[PDB]
């Protein structure tokens, strides 16, 4: 029920890249989901702003919304593909995999 | 209706710091609120992960939730107060004011 890391299975075979992409054709990206409320566990590593927002939402939920569960650390993946010129490319893309979730 | 920066007026006079805090007694923190969906305007500066999540939510909203509107840049404020030893302290606190919002 609380802010945590749940799966997200990304299938590049929908993407329409079939003539070009070699690997990976699928990868585990994860996503962040769940309530952001007291108590803010230490792994949510809340900013000062998030603590203050969470407090205000707790004192009067009509005035102020809760913070939100989102990725706080992400990591790259690399994709092996053939380009138009027919070169074999292996390229790193940043921010592809959620490594940690947090309330923000 | 879209992910943008709305006000949040923080009143330190609830906080129970009255014997100690000199200034500021109030500050504008802002908060992030609103829908995260195509089109992702350039100011939301979406990560690769957020674009992919947004696409998956668009193809099948039952499977995958939308990303979330959150602070992407924050700035400090400084607080002037008297400590227990009766010293006048002026301390910077990080991540107090939302400077920009984004979909994550």
Swiss-Prot record, chains A, B:
Where in the body, by tissue, does this protein show up?
A: Predominantly expressed in long bones during embryonic development. Expressed in monocytes (at protein level).
Q: List the disulfide bonds.
A: 3-69, 32-101, 36-103
Per UniProt, what does mutating residue 41 to L do?
Answer: In SYNS2 and SYM1B; increased biological activity when compared to wild-type; normal binding to BMPR1B ectodomain but increased binding to that of BMPR1A
Q: What outcome is documented for mutating residue 2 to C in this protein?
A: In BDA1C; less effective than wild-type in stimulating chondrogenesis; impairs BMP signaling through BMPR1A
Locations listed in the record? Secreted; Cell membrane
Complex formation: Homodimer; disulfide-linked. Interacts with serine proteases, HTRA1 and HTRA3. Following LPS binding, may form a complex with CXCR4, HSP90AA1 and HSPA8. Interacts with high affinity with NOG; inhibits chondrogenesis. Interacts with high affinity with BMPR1B and lower affinity with BMPR1A; positively regulates chondrocyte differentiation and induces SMAD dependent signaling. Interacts with FBN1 (via N-terminal domain) and FBN2. Interacts with TGFBR3.
Role noted for this protein: Growth factor involved in bone and cartilage formation. During cartilage development regulates differentiation of chondrogenic tissue through two pathways. Firstly, positively regulates differentiation of chondrogenic tissue through its binding of high affinity with BMPR1B and of less affinity with BMPR1A, leading to induction of SMAD1-SMAD5-SMAD8 complex phosphorylation and then SMAD protein signaling transduction. Secondly, negatively regulates chondrogenic differentiation through its interaction with NOG. Required to prevent excessive muscle loss upon denervation.
Illness association: Acromesomelic dysplasia 2A: A form of acromesomelic dysplasia, a skeletal disorder characterized by short stature, very short limbs and hand/foot malformations. The severity of limb abnormalities increases from proximal to distal with profoundly affected hands and feet showing brachydactyly and/or rudimentary fingers (knob-like fingers). AMD2A is an autosomal recessive form characterized by normal axial skeletons and missing or fused skeletal elements within the hands and feet. Acromesomelic dysplasia 2C: A form of acromesomelic dysplasia, a skeletal disorder characterized by short stature, very short limbs and hand/foot malformations. The severity of limb abnormalities increases from proximal to distal with profoundly affected hands and feet showing brachydactyly and/or rudimentary fingers (knob-like fingers). AMD2C is an autosomal recessive form characterized by skeletal abnormalities restricted to the limbs. The craniofacial skeleton and axial skeletal structures are normal.
Name this protein carries in UniProt: Growth/differentiation factor 5
Q: Which gene encodes it?
A: GDF5
């Amino acid at each position: 029920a609380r802010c945590s890391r749940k799966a997200l299975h990304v299938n590049f075979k929908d993407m329409g890249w079939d003539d070009w992409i070699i690997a990976p054709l699928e990868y585990e990206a994860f996503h962040c989901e769940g309530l952001c409320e007291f108590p803010l566990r230490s792994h949510l590593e809340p900013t000062n702003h998030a603590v203050i927002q969470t407090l205000m939402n707790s004192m009067d939920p009509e005035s102020t919304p809760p913070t939100c569960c989102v990725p706080t650390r992400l990591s790259p993946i690399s994709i092996l593909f053939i380009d138009s010129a027919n070169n074999v490319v292996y390229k790193q893309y940043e921010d592809m995999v959620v490594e940690s979730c947090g309330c923000r």
